[PDB]
RNA sequence: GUUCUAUUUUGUUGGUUUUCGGAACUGAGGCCAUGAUUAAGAGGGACGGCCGGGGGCAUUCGUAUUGCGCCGCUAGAGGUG
């Protein structure tokens, strides 16, 4: 909880891994390595109902809690790594991703570079479902 | 040329060998305007440069998965209308 950075000269960089499933949203801030983490709070930790854990309100509260816990240490800027369900399943991020990103941007985390770290397979295994699908 | 032979014939009775004709075999010729229709918008094949997720064998790469090992923080994570 002690920042060695000079205040006006530069900012301390971290990176958030915004995981956006269709049933929950993870907002996870780690360092430049990713091995050491800083703050992780979810939509289910903020809203105690399973059906709206991936809701933009829950992702917004999770992003506000992440930004407050990160300003408690003094990391100022965050790179953004958007991550989806991935694999054989869906590759489009959920509704909480843009809400959490805009929420941390309003709460005051300096936006670095944004990229997709979605685990898009080259050629995956068999998708969970029948030959007729999830009807 | 070789073998066989219907017989006409030597005035009439007999043999042998020829001229002349028919059957088979066999050598040197002369001639054909000498002799093989075209190459199917039929087909087969050779040859040339290709072309192609065609086939078989060996090798190599890519991610994702799931499981394990180590590290960081955590009370939720999955999943559904
Ligand atoms: Mg079924």
Sheet strand arrangement including A13-20: A37-42, A25-30, A13-20, A77-83, A110-116
Query: What gap in Å lies between CA A116 and CA A135, rounded to an integer?
Result: 30
Experiment type: cryo-EM
Q: How far is the CA of A127 from the C1' of B74 (A)?
A: 31
Q: How many residues does chain A have?
A: 135
Q: In chain A, which ranges are continuous DSSP H helix?
A: 43-46, 56-71, 96-107
End-to-end CA distance of chain A: 51
Q: Which two tokens stand for residue A3?
A: 């920042």
Chain B bases under 7 Å from protein CB? 62-65, 71-81
Q: How far is the CA of A36 from the C1' of B6 (A)?
A: 139
Resolution in units of Å: 3.0
Query: What gap in Å lies between CA A81 and CA A118, rounded to an integer?
Result: 8
Decide if A60 contacts A105 (C-beta within 8 A).
no
Assess whether A33 (CB) lies less than 7 A from strand B: no
Assess whether A8 (CB) lies less than 7 A from strand B: no
Place of tokens 């300096």: A110
How far apart, in Å, are the Cα atoms of A114 and each of A60, A62, A78?
18, 19, 9
Query: What gap in Å lies between CA A59 and CA A97, rounded to an integer?
Result: 7
Q: In A6-95, which ranges are continuous DSSP H helix?
A: 43-46, 56-71
Query: What gap in Å lies between CA A126 and CA A87, rounded to an integer?
Result: 10
Q: Which two tokens stand for residue A110?
A: 């300096």
Instruction: Quote the ligand 1 centre to A126 CA distance (angstroms).
Output: 14
Q: Which two tokens stand for residue A129?
A: 């479902």
Instruction: Quote the ligand 1 centre to A129 CA distance (angstroms).
Output: 7
Instruction: Quote the ligand 1 centre to A20 CA distance (angstroms).
Output: 26
């Amino acid at each position: 909880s002690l920042g060695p950075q000079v205040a006006e000269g530069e900012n301390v960089f971290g990176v958030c891994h915004i995981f956006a499933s269709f049933n929950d949203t993870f907002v996870h801030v780690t360092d430049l390595s990713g091995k050491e983490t800083i703050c992780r709070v979810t939509g289910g930790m903020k809203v105690k109902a399973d059906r709206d854990e991936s809701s933009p309100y829950a992702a917004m509260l999770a992003a506000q809690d992440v930004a407050q816990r990160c300003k408690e240490l003094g990391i100022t800027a965050l790179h953004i790594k958007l991550r989806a369900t991935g694999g054989n399943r869906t590759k489009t991020p959920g509704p909480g991703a843009q809400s959490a990103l805009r929420a941390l941007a309003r709460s005051g985390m300096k936006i670095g570079r944004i990229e997709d770290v979605t685990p898009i397979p080259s050629d995956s295994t068999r998708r969970k479902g029948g030959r007729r699908g999830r009807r």
